[PDB]
Amino acid sequence: WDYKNIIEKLQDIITALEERLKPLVQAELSVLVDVLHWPELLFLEGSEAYQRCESGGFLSKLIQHTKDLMESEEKLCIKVLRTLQQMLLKKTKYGDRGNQLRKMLLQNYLQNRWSAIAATQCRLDKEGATKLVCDLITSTKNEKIFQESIGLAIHLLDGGNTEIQKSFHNLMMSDKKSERFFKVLHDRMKRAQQETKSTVAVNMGTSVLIMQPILRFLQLLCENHNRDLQNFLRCQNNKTNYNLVCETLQFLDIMCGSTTGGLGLLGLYINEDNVGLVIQTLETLTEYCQGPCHENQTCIVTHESNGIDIITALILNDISPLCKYRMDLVLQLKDNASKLLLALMESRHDSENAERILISLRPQELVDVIKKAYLQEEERENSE
Amino acid sequence: DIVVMETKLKILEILQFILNVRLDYRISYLLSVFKKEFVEVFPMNMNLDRIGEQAEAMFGSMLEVDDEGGRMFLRVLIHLTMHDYAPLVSGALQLLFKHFSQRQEAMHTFKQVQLLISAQDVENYKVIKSELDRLRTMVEKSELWVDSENYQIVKGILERLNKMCGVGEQMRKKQQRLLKNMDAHKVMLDLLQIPYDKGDAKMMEILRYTHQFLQKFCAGNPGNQALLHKHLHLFLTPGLLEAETMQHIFLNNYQLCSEISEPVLQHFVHLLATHGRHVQYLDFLHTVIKAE
Amino acid sequence: FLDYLSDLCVSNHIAIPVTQELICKCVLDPKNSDILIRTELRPVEEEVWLTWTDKNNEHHEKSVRQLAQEARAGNAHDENVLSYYRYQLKLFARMCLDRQYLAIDEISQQLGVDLIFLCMADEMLPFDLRASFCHLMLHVHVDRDPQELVTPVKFARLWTEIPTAITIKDYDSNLNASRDDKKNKFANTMEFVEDYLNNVVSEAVPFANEEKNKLTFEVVSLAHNLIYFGFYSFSELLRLTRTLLGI
Ligand SMILES: [Ca+2]
């Protein structure tokens, strides 16, 4: 017997089977989402189980059990959170074979019985998804569970759902543990800032990678210029208040190198890996200030960290290292910075913000930047 | 009623066992198809399309657990998930999640299949099987011979297994994988739990040999190291051999050393403060400090 | 007091060898043989008779069927002796938990497999007595040295032991010899378990009667233990899955 040849052929067959069955695996996993959507179809109409399933009792019980099993079985909690996130996602195609398998499975199980996303989000919120997310974020000590909770929050709030925002605000206000929620968020923000500062001093860490989902969640809270959420993120009216707008500005300032970055060394600090996080931070600040929220604008403009200078430098500076290789990201960064600066002066008749911005954003350099951007069109490459 | 919930839990456990048996049958079917194709191609190219088609077909059938094509199974799982008893709901949820991952589970299990073709491999497999079976049978009757020829036979079996562990990086890895597949570690751990008196030198020698085998089992193998770490509570006792085994388990393992729990670390300092027997505790701490 | 000894035998559903051995050395000692009801089978095909010594050291022997009939009639002494026997059987099962061979060797001789099967299968006895006998059979005979837990999935397989074509019947025929060998002993128990499960599933409300729930739980636990010891082939397991799901 050819031992080596037999092993090699077995490995080749394993690889081929793994490659072949991937769409089928995806379709089979997807069918679970449909089953969870309409459990009552498994039972007979008019039965007690049918009544329990139809009214959403199954989903509410699942959410309650997920809350209960946070400490008993972390893996099961992660699996259920991922399943909920998949339930909140848009439909996808898995090829001809995948679609055939999915249709066959749906027929076998269920005999013949953005608007959809919004309806699903509202249904999950009714079943208590928002409360589950808040409880998990406040109480969980597991990094994976926290990540899944933040992802579920983002999926629930995706697209700027007013009902989900109202539910979040009601939970933050009425509930007595909102203080712990904001304290946890503030502590994670501070840890990310400290890690980024240490890395910058040395010269990308889970504590820094987690900032992207947190910033996205905070932006989604304030989406569509939600004044209540915009003001709450600055002051919570609790015994101790955590200003997340100020912390976001501080994170942006530390990421870009602080005063040294503003002087003109911004290019070194910003690179391909961390550019997306800076873009997300700029978008979050813009969502904070737009609507407008005058208090947030004043907080950002008059901050002691002088983070407005960072934004002006972002607009003026060329980002020499990154721009040579990826000019599209630099253009996106400049566009986001300009949007943030515009939002900082949305409906301010006084000149305070304008003068503060002009202190660091000199007119000649701004005009030169505008002219260079206009002339760069002939050198533009195919990009969004 | 609690009785009904316990009965349903037992039924669920039976269902898990039968599903595992079905998974084993699927793996056997895939192996048979592969062997048939290999024999056809090499009586002394491969049509991978046919094998892929057969694998896809085998997941379609007589392997179903109900006459409704899995509808009754899903209905029962949902109904049980609606119940209040936490263990029952957890089991139902686990079965529900496993239901829609059959292809992934089958591929994962097929990846781990180990084939024994060489004559030396077959002889090693037979010897290990016989030795482990005899050791398990003798350990199961501890009360009969524990304070006879049992001690000598057990000592010979431990020495034979220790010699069978192998020498050489590739040989050691292969033998460790084979021993893991034959569940020798479970037999050794069960032997450690055997009750015995403190004034039997023969039993002390047997336990020393068992600890040596356990240390050789996880020597340089992160998988076996984690497998033994799954049963830490046995080794957390006031002994020198236990300290050596703990050191070997944690030796060169960042995933284990970094995430070492507080009570485990306090255990050795407590022993040093109260006993201070030897330098074994200090050695364990030193190896825990650095990893990879 | 027998119940209290039973709790002392175990802790958190896990047998403690020390206390188990201490209780076994005393309960089963010949000097304390007057506090345990003796059970035997006589031709009289065969009938099970219980003989016990009263408080005043008076021997009393009676058939189990007579005890059950009198207890159902309304007699209190027969009910008391039946309850004492049930608690004694519970204590015997507990003392043999986790393969305590010291007590298993003694108990097996007094209560054989055939006697326990006859007592449990009889439908004239109360469900509690049948449940106790099923528990004793599970914890005295099934969980013995010959039986061993079987891993359903095997990762190490010989190249020469892989058939070219495999079916369910051929798949389960690899080790049919050992299965038949253990069937030669446990065939009656397996048939009784299958019939009981079929009857339970046939009923509209399987968990209606509270008394029958205990017997159902013991039968299900016995089936679980038998399955986990490889007493059934894949085809029989597939057949039994339908009944288990229907229940
Ligand atoms: Ca024993």
Side-chain angles (χ1 to χ4, degrees), chain A residues 1-202 204-384, chain B residues 1-43 46-292, chain C residues 1-44 46-247:
Chain A
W1 286 121
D2 297 300
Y3 179 63
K4 328 312 310 312
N5 203 8
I6 286 160
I7 279 161
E8 188 171 59
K9 296 295 159 243
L10 191 83
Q11 276 275 10
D12 268 0
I13 272 282
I14 287 154
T15 325
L17 289 165
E18 211 182 329
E19 187 253 352
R20 184 158 178 165
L21 295 188
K22 192 183 299 312
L24 302 196
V25 165
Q26 292 300 118
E28 197 187 9
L29 186 38
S30 87
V31 168
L32 173 57
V33 165
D34 293 297
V35 164
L36 292 176
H37 265 306
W38 300 282
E40 66 276 350
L41 300 185
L42 279 162
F43 301 88
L44 216 38
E45 187 152 55
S47 325
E48 316 71 326
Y50 193 97
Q51 296 169 11
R52 290 206 60 177
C53 281
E54 205 227 331
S55 52
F58 174 65
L59 265 170
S60 67
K61 209 281 161 213
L62 180 68
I63 283 156
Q64 196 79 74
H65 193 244
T66 301
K67 180 178 172 189
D68 284 324
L69 56 94
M70 183 184 70
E71 55 269 20
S72 299
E73 297 92 1
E74 294 164 301
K75 292 200 203 325
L76 201 63
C77 205
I78 292 158
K79 257 192 179 182
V80 174
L81 291 172
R82 286 208 196 103
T83 308
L84 294 157
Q85 287 170 53
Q86 272 271 125
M87 232 192 301
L88 285 162
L89 272 181
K90 186 180 283 185
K91 286 282 169 68
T92 315
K93 289 290 185 179
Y94 324 90
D96 298 53
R97 292 161 40 196
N99 296 129
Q100 180 63 12
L101 178 63
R102 185 169 180 288
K103 162 147 57 75
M104 268 305 108
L105 286 173
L106 284 185
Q107 163 93 336
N108 183 78
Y109 296 130
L110 325 177
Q111 299 283 120
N112 56 3
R113 285 86 73 90
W114 286 94
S115 297
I117 284 170
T120 308
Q121 291 164 349
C122 287
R123 184 164 148 72
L124 261 75
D125 172 75
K126 181 181 187 298
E127 301 324 309
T130 311
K131 194 177 174 56
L132 168 74
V133 161
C134 285
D135 289 339
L136 293 172
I137 284 160
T138 302
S139 310
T140 198
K141 259 112 195 154
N142 184 299
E143 293 296 302
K144 291 181 187 299
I145 288 170
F146 180 86
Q147 280 167 238
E148 293 311 313
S149 304
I150 296 283
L152 180 55
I154 288 160
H155 280 106
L156 287 163
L157 280 159
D158 197 359
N161 200 310
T162 309
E163 294 308 298
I164 306 305
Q165 286 165 348
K166 181 57 170 188
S167 307
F168 266 109
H169 193 226
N170 286 351
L171 278 174
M172 284 156 201
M173 269 183 333
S174 77
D175 202 351
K176 309 291 286 299
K177 71 186 223 291
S178 192
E179 176 131 17
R180 319 209 263 131
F181 186 84
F182 278 91
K183 169 159 173 49
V184 165
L185 289 183
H186 187 280
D187 293 353
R188 274 180 183 289
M189 277 195 201
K190 281 295 197 195
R191 214 249 289 290
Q193 288 171 15
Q194 177 267 324
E195 246 305 332
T196 299
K197 184 167 224 308
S198 265
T199 51
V200 161
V202 165
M204 50 172 165
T206 189
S207 34
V208 187
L209 292 196
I210 201 68
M211 275 306 264
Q212 178 87 239
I214 292 166
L215 292 169
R216 178 59 171 147
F217 168 65
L218 290 174
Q219 191 207 357
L220 278 169
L221 280 171
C222 295
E223 178 58 64
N224 299 307
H225 325 307
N226 200 339
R227 228 177 209 81
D228 278 357
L229 276 293
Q230 279 170 344
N231 283 287
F232 208 74
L233 292 188
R234 195 187 61 262
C235 192
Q236 300 91 47
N237 281 87
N238 298 130
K239 298 178 187 180
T240 280
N241 284 314
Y242 307 86
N243 192 342
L244 303 194
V245 184
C246 156
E247 294 307 330
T248 306
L249 186 58
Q250 283 184 265
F251 184 61
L252 182 88
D253 177 86
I254 295 199
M255 263 270 264
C256 284
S258 198
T259 297
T260 302
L263 297 204
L265 291 300
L266 217 73
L268 330 171
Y269 296 89
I270 303 180
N271 57 72
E272 186 174 0
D273 291 313
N274 67 341
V275 66
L277 191 46
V278 180
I279 293 166
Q280 180 59 59
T281 311
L282 291 166
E283 283 176 293
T284 308
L285 295 161
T286 312
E287 203 70 71
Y288 286 162
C289 282
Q290 269 188 356
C293 192
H294 284 149
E295 311 89 314
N296 285 354
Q297 291 171 344
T298 311
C299 167
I300 291 179
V301 170
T302 70
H303 197 238
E304 57 261 53
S305 71
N306 295 300
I308 193 72
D309 300 320
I310 291 282
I311 303 156
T312 58
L314 276 166
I315 281 163
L316 288 180
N317 220 275
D318 228 337
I319 331 302
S320 155
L322 189 61
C323 83
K324 294 168 64 168
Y325 300 127
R326 297 215 63 181
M327 179 56 78
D328 55 304
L329 305 184
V330 170
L331 291 169
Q332 210 180 124
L333 209 67
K334 280 161 138 58
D335 203 54
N336 276 115
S338 71
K339 284 168 168 185
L340 174 51
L341 274 186
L342 279 161
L344 282 171
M345 281 168 0
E346 209 163 62
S347 300
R348 297 294 299 271
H349 311 306
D350 58 358
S351 61
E352 205 211 54
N353 307 149
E355 304 170 311
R356 184 66 187 76
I357 289 156
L358 274 156
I359 278 166
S360 32
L361 200 73
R362 304 310 301 159
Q364 185 63 65
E365 280 101 62
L366 190 61
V367 171
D368 299 343
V369 163
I370 291 158
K371 288 165 172 183
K372 190 145 145 290
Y374 176 94
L375 283 180
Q376 201 175 306
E377 185 71 2
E378 71 204 357
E379 304 159 1
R380 180 198 167 183
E381 301 180 1
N382 300 6
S383 61
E384 305 185 5
Chain B
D1 190 36
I2 194 174
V3 173
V4 179
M5 308 285 108
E6 296 290 273
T7 313
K8 291 171 169 192
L9 263 177
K10 297 296 284 268
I11 293 162
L12 255 67
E13 283 149 43
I14 291 163
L15 290 176
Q16 312 198 1
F17 185 86
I18 296 170
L19 290 176
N20 283 121
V21 171
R22 181 178 69 168
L23 178 56
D24 185 57
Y25 171 81
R26 266 152 180 191
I27 295 300
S28 296
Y29 183 77
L30 227 53
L31 282 166
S32 74
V33 165
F34 161 77
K35 195 205 184 284
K36 192 182 184 202
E37 182 79 350
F38 187 94
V39 166
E40 166 53 24
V41 171
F42 304 108
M46 270 261 194
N47 199 299
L48 286 80
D49 192 74
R50 288 286 301 278
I51 290 163
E53 186 175 10
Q54 303 229 50
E56 288 201 335
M58 102 188 157
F59 288 113
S61 59
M62 302 78 42
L63 313 183
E64 211 34 87
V65 295
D66 49 21
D67 295 329
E68 308 197 42
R71 271 200 313 288
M72 166 148 92
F73 185 62
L74 248 184
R75 197 190 329 132
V76 167
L77 284 175
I78 296 285
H79 189 230
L80 295 163
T81 310
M82 227 87 90
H83 285 58
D84 305 279
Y85 202 48
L88 192 57
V89 179
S90 196
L93 282 165
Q94 300 255 21
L95 278 166
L96 179 77
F97 279 115
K98 288 177 77 65
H99 185 84
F100 293 96
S101 289
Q102 292 176 48
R103 285 167 188 81
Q104 192 187 18
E105 206 189 11
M107 282 301 123
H108 192 253
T109 306
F110 199 55
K111 283 173 192 128
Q112 304 181 232
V113 167
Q114 158 164 56
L115 283 174
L116 311 181
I117 327 185
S118 179
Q120 182 59 82
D121 289 332
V122 173
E123 262 316 347
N124 288 117
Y125 178 93
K126 292 177 168 149
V127 167
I128 294 160
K129 175 181 265 307
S130 67
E131 292 295 289
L132 293 170
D133 210 51
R134 298 185 38 41
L135 184 63
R136 209 157 25 212
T137 310
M138 206 135 39
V139 165
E140 180 163 39
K141 294 278 174 65
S142 55
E143 296 144 335
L144 268 68
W145 54 285
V146 71
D147 286 327
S148 65
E149 296 85 2
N150 303 275
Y151 283 86
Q152 173 55 23
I153 302 159
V154 168
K155 190 166 136 323
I157 292 158
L158 281 317
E159 283 152 35
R160 207 177 334 310
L161 293 162
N162 277 329
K163 189 170 175 65
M164 161 81 37
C165 263
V167 186
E169 184 73 354
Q170 64 193 7
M171 204 69 25
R172 178 162 284 284
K173 286 167 60 53
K174 185 184 197 72
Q175 294 285 317
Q176 278 165 10
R177 197 203 178 172
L178 187 64
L179 289 159
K180 186 210 80 183
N181 285 332
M182 311 231 66
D183 294 317
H185 56 276
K186 281 158 82 123
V187 185
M188 293 317 206
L189 292 184
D190 251 11
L191 171 51
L192 286 183
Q193 303 213 56
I194 193 169
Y196 65 109
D197 199 31
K198 300 288 284 186
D200 185 14
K202 304 170 84 186
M203 195 55 150
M204 294 314 189
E205 196 168 15
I206 288 160
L207 291 161
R208 188 195 153 185
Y209 268 118
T210 278
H211 283 105
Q212 285 179 5
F213 178 91
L214 289 162
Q215 296 158 9
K216 291 167 171 162
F217 178 71
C218 63
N221 194 349
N224 294 7
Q225 272 180 356
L227 216 80
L228 271 167
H229 187 260
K230 198 102 76 208
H231 315 262
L232 272 185
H233 49 88
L234 305 128
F235 304 123
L236 286 181
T237 62
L240 304 170
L241 280 165
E242 285 105 296
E244 295 189 38
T245 308
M246 294 223 61
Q247 183 209 138
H248 273 283
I249 289 157
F250 279 101
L251 195 139
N252 284 122
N253 208 327
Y254 188 101
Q255 222 262 14
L256 297 186
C257 290
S258 64
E259 313 203 354
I260 192 167
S261 62
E262 184 87 50
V264 175
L265 266 165
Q266 267 150 240
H267 179 240
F268 284 76
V269 309
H270 180 323
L271 273 304
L272 270 159
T274 72
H275 291 104
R277 293 208 171 71
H278 291 291
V279 315
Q280 266 73 26
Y281 319 102
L282 299 176
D283 298 5
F284 166 78
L285 296 162
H286 198 171
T287 74
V288 155
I289 279 162
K290 188 188 269 190
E292 291 332 301
Chain C
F1 300 130
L2 284 163
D3 201 65
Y4 292 144
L5 285 159
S6 322
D7 322 73
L8 291 174
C9 277
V10 71
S11 157
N12 210 341
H13 288 253
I14 295 284
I16 330 171
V18 175
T19 56
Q20 210 166 60
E21 192 156 343
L22 284 320
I23 297 196
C24 287
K25 284 284 183 29
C26 299
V27 174
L28 294 153
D29 212 274
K31 54 183 325 293
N32 304 325
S33 82
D34 323 318
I35 53 156
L36 305 169
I37 297 168
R38 270 272 139 180
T39 181
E40 57 161 37
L41 69 104
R42 53 181 76 187
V44 164
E46 301 173 336
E47 312 194 351
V48 185
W49 283 59
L50 272 45
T51 307
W52 67 91
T53 36
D54 210 344
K55 268 167 198 193
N56 201 1
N57 314 129
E58 315 303 336
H59 312 299
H60 304 300
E61 48 167 2
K62 274 188 83 173
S63 78
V64 179
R65 304 168 160 268
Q66 194 81 237
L67 269 75
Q69 288 219 334
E70 215 72 44
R72 272 195 302 278
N75 190 350
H77 173 235
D78 271 299
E79 195 71 73
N80 284 278
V81 68
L82 280 175
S83 266
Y84 192 83
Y85 191 59
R86 284 197 309 98
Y87 274 88
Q88 184 191 302
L89 291 182
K90 182 177 168 283
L91 176 58
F92 282 13
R94 195 65 57 78
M95 286 183 1
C96 295
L97 181 61
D98 285 327
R99 311 196 184 211
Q100 185 70 5
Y101 284 99
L102 290 187
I104 284 164
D105 293 330
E106 184 63 25
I107 282 153
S108 55
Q109 291 201 45
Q110 191 199 136
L111 280 144
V113 189
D114 291 358
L115 180 58
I116 299 167
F117 168 74
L118 171 62
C119 287
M120 70 193 304
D122 209 286
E123 270 141 331
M124 323 270 312
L125 317 183
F127 286 124
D128 49 27
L129 202 78
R130 301 168 64 172
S132 286
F133 274 105
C134 196
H135 199 253
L136 195 77
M137 161 96 60
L138 163 56
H139 274 116
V140 175
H141 292 308
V142 170
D143 211 359
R144 200 158 180 120
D145 166 50
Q147 277 64 235
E148 214 257 316
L149 192 71
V150 304
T151 323
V153 179
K154 294 284 177 72
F155 282 124
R157 291 147 175 273
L158 298 170
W159 181 251
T160 88
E161 295 278 21
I162 292 159
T164 59
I166 199 81
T167 58
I168 288 161
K169 171 172 198 64
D170 304 303
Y171 168 77
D172 59 51
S173 99
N174 286 309
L175 51 87
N176 204 347
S178 51
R179 280 194 290 101
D180 211 43
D181 292 315
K182 60 187 76 172
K183 188 170 280 180
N184 169 71
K185 203 184 270 172
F186 286 100
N188 281 272
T189 309
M190 285 194 247
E191 185 168 16
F192 160 78
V193 164
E194 198 168 0
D195 301 342
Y196 189 92
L197 294 178
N198 291 10
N199 297 342
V200 166
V201 68
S202 99
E203 287 170 348
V205 191
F207 302 114
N209 194 354
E210 217 209 350
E211 283 288 313
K212 207 176 150 61
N213 285 1
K214 307 183 172 70
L215 181 57
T216 310
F217 167 81
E218 316 275 335
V219 167
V220 163
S221 56
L222 185 65
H224 170 285
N225 267 260
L226 287 165
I227 289 156
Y228 271 65
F229 287 136
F231 277 70
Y232 293 111
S233 37
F234 191 27
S235 61
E236 321 200 59
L237 292 168
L238 286 167
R239 182 168 44 262
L240 197 96
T241 55
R242 284 102 165 100
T243 303
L244 284 180
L245 282 171
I247 288 165

